[PDB]
Every structure is written in C-alpha cells, then in structure tokens.
Amino acid sequence: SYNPEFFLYDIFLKFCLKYIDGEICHDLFLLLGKYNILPYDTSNDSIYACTNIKHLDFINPFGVAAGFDKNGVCIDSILKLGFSFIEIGTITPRGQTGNAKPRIFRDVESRSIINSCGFNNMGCDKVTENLILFRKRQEEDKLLSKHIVGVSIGKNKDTVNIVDDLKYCINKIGRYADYIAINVSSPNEAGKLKNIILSVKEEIDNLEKNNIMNDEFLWFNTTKKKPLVFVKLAPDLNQEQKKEIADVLLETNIDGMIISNTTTQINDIKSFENKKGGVSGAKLKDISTKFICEMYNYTNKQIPIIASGGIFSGLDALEKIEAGASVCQLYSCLVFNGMKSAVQIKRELNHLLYQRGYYNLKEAIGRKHS
Numbered sequence: 266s267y268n269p270e271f272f273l274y275d276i277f278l279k280f281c282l283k284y285i286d287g288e289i290c291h292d293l294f295l296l297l298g299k300y301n302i303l304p305y306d307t308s309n310d311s312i313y314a315c316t317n318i319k320h321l322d323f324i325n326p327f328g329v330a331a332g333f334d335k336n337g338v339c340i341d342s343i344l345k346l347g348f349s350f351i352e353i354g355t356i357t358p359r360g361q362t363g364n365a366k367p368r369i370f371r372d373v374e375s376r377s378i379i380n381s382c383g384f385n386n387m388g389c390d391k392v393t394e395n396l397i398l399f400r401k402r403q404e405e406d407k408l409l410s411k412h413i414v415g416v417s418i419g420k421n422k423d424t425v426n427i428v429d430d431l432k433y434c435i436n437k438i439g440r441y442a443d444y445i446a447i448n449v450s451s452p453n454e455a456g457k458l459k460n461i462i463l464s465v466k467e468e469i470d471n472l473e474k475n476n477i478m479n480d481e482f483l484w485f486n487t488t489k490k491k492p493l494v495f496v497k498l499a500p501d502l503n504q505e506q507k508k509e510i511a512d513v514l515l516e517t518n519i520d521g522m523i524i525s526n527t528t529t530q531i532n533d534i535k536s537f538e539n540k541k542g543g544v545s546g547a548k549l550k551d552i553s554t555k556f557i558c559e560m561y562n563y564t565n566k567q568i569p570i571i572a573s574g575g576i577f578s579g580l581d582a583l584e585k586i587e588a589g590a591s592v593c594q595l596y597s598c599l600v601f602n603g604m605k606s607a608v609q610i611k612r613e614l615n616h617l618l619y620q621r622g623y624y625n626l627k628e629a630i631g632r633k634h635s
C-alpha cells in the first residue's frame with residue numbers, strides 16, 4: 266500500500282496473473298530476483314515470534330516451501346522479501362526436464378494451484394554450485410546473516426536405488442545445507458522409509474566422521490552444524506499408514522516433519538477438472554491442518570512440525586501453530602499475494618498473537634490439543 270516498491274510490484278503481479286502463463290510468471294519473477302530488483306523487507310522481526318526446531322533457530326516463523334526455487338537461482342532475493350528460510354529443490358542427482366508444459370495452472374477464485382512439474386531440476390552438481398555461490402554472497406550480505414537454507418532431495422525417476430540417490434545428494438550439497446528434507450512424497454513399505462531415513466542420517470554423520478576440518482570449515486552453512494534431517498509427507502494417506510509412519514519417525518529419531526505436500530483428493534475445482542497433478546493453496550488448508558493434528562498426536566508431541574500449506578494470513582498461520590506446527594512455509598501465497606506476502610503475514614500473526622493473549626509464538630504451539 267504505502268510502500269511504493271511493493272505496491273508497484275503487486276500491480277505488476279496482478280497483470281501477470283491475469284494475462285501470463287504461471288510457470289512463465291514464476292520464471293520472470295525468479296529472473297527479477299536474480300538481478301536484484303525485487304523489494305527488501307529491512308524491518309526487525311518481533312522477538313516474540315522467533316521459533317526453533319531443535320538447535321535450528323528461525324528469526325521469524327515464515328519460510329518458502331520446496332519447488333519454488335528448485336535450482337537455487339534466486340535464494341538471496343526471495344529470503345530478503347522477509348522470510349527466515351527457504352527450502353530449495355526438490356533436487357535429484359542428475360538433472361530432469363520434468364513433464365510436458367504447461368504443467369502449472371492457477372484457480373484465482375479458490376486461490377489454488379495444480380501442478381505436474383515432475384521434478385524438473387538442473388541436477389545436484391549444478392544446484393550445489395548455485396548454493397555454494399549463495400553461501401559466499403551470504404558472507405558479504407548483511408540482510409542474509411542468520412537466514413536458513415534447507416535442501417529438498419529426491420530420487421531420479423528411474424533410479425536403481427532410492428538410498429544411493431539420496432547419498433549422492435548429501436555427499437555433494439550436505440556441507441552447504443542447514444537441513445535436508447527427504448521428499449519421497451510427491452505426485453508426478455514403512456521399513457523402506459526407516460532405511461531411507463537411517464541411510465540419510467548416516468551419510469551426514471559420515472561427512473562429519475571423515476572430513477579432517479573443524480566444523481567452522483566443514484559446514485559452510487548458517488548453523489555451522491551438520492544439517493538436520495526432515496521428511497516431507499503427502500496428505501493422501503489412510504489412518505493406518507499415518508500411524509505406521511509415526512512409528513518410523515519416532516524410531517529413527519527424525520529431526521522434524523514437513524506436513525504436507527500437495528493433494529490429489531480435491532475434486533471440486535471447476536477449472537481443474539481436465540487437469541492432473543497435486544493441488545496447493547486454500548483448498549489444501551483444512552486437509553493439511555487436520556494432518557498436522559493427527560501426526561502431532563501419533564508422534565506423542567515428540568517430533569517438530571513444519572507446516573505447509575494453504576497458508577495466506579496471520580490467522581491461517583496461527584491455526585497451523587495451534588495444531589502443532591513450530592514454523593510455516595508459504596508457496597501459493599506468493600503466487601496470489603505477491604512480494605508483500607511475508608511482511609503482511611508476519612504483521613498479521615504478531616497482532617493476532619497479542620489479541621489472543623499469547624506472550625510469544627512458542628506458547629501457541631500445539632495449544633489446540635486441550
């Protein structure tokens with residue numbers, strides 16, 4: 266509104282939404298970020314809305330979800346919109362072109378998206394080089410100081426074993442990540458998951474084990490510690506599957522769970538009737554929130570939750586927090602609300618936390634459970 270850089274951008278984004286293909290719009294804004302002409306949020310975040318996952322400390326509770334910057338080409342400018350963190354990827358060991366275009370469609374009226382990108386990415390080696398270059402800029406760029414970068418990692422479509430795909434990614438990019446997100450949930454048994462999770466924690470342990478450098482020099486990342494390990498879960502699961510996965514997460518000592526990925530359970534979006542892929546945005550909100558409550562329960566409140574999505578407003582964020590989330594990720598909100606998304610949502614959450622009588626954010630976590 267009053268700030269002109271954000272105002273001009275959000276008129277422009279309105280135009281793009283109306284006229285221009287979604288993926289094209291995405292790439293255009295990625296390109297504007299790469300050349301550093303997006304607005305900055307240079308305001309101090311409220312100390313009462315800080316949050317953490319184990320010893321990973323978030324300056325504010327809002328990050329950007331995976332799939333947004335698949336190749337880490339725009340990390341600086343996206344963070345500087347006011348986010349405390351970003352999950353780049355999903356990356357795979359070798360590059361993949363993804364499914365035929367067009368493959369991202371928006372329904373403005375329901376503020377929802379469907380996609381069948383199919384894990385398009387430049388591959389691990391190139392993204393690692395992109396993240397390295399980010400880490401070097403981060404040493405020089407004051408507004409990036411304590412900002413977190415996680416890396417989502419996945420299997421190549423046709424792989425000979427999932428485990429070794431993940432190990433290759435870890436070995437390449439692990440030193441530059443603050444956390445690693447295991448994405449084995451995506452459109453486009455549980456003993457298999459246990460072995461995946463254990464193989465990942467082991468490869469990270471092995472980076473530590475057999476590098477001769479002190480941690481200051483091995484971990485070229487924000488925390489200067491080894492990356493935490495999270496898993497991202499798809500919401501299209503039966504109650505038994507959820508219970509089983511909960512057990513695996515408890516047993517492997519996973520650092521956190523990202524709940525949730527996109528859903529294929531949505532049938533009532535008119536403009537999407539011909540379309541396949543997973544649905545994001547407002548129509549996912551209730552499903553994701555229900556799923557957070559369930560996994561919070563099934564894991565005995567022992568596993569920190571990263572919420573995603575249908576998160577647009579301060580209210581949406583608080584719902585996720587009170588359902589059990591420690592931190593929130595946005596994707597669709599950036600598509601529909603533009604450059605101002607983080608500024609506006611942080612303010613709305615702050616005002617809401619106060620109205621509800623909460624001293625801080627951490628106080629609200631899980632509060633809907635009695």
Ligand SMILES: Cc1cc2nc3c(=O)[nH]c(=O)nc-3n(C[C@H](O)[C@H](O)[C@H](O)COP(=O)(O)O)c2cc1C
Pocket residue numbers: 330331332333335354355369378380382384417448497525526527544545546547549573574575576594595596597598
């Ligand atoms: C175009 C598109 C691509 C995505 N790619 C990924 C992906 O690479 N890895 C992943 O874990 N999630 C991916 N997601 C899912 C998002 O990370 C997020 O979980 C989902 O959009 C729900 O959040 P939202 O309702 O705020 O959009 C993608 C979503 C969309 C819209």
Ligand SMILES: Cc1cc(Nc2ccc3ccccc3c2)[n+]2[nH]c[nH+]c2n1
Pocket residue numbers: 278281282286287288290291292294295298303339343369371599600603604
């Ligand atoms: C208009 C639009 C934008 C967009 N993506 C955006 C939005 C905001 C961004 C901010 C910074 C950097 C990149 C960004 C990309 N999409 N995505 C899929 N449809 C679509 N339509």
Ligand SMILES: CCCCCCCCCCCC[N+](C)(C)[O-]
Pocket residue numbers: 473478479480481
């Ligand atoms: C108060 C200064 C601390 C002393 C500096 C020494 C750094 C040691 C931390 C790096 C750990 C190396 N190691 C054992 C994990 O492989």
Ligand SMILES: O=C(O)c1cc(=O)[nH]c(=O)[nH]1
Pocket residue numbers: 332355380381382383384385448450451452453526527543544
């Ligand atoms: O690349 C994709 O198609 C994709 C990955 C994912 O994890 N979620 C999603 O909705 N799409």
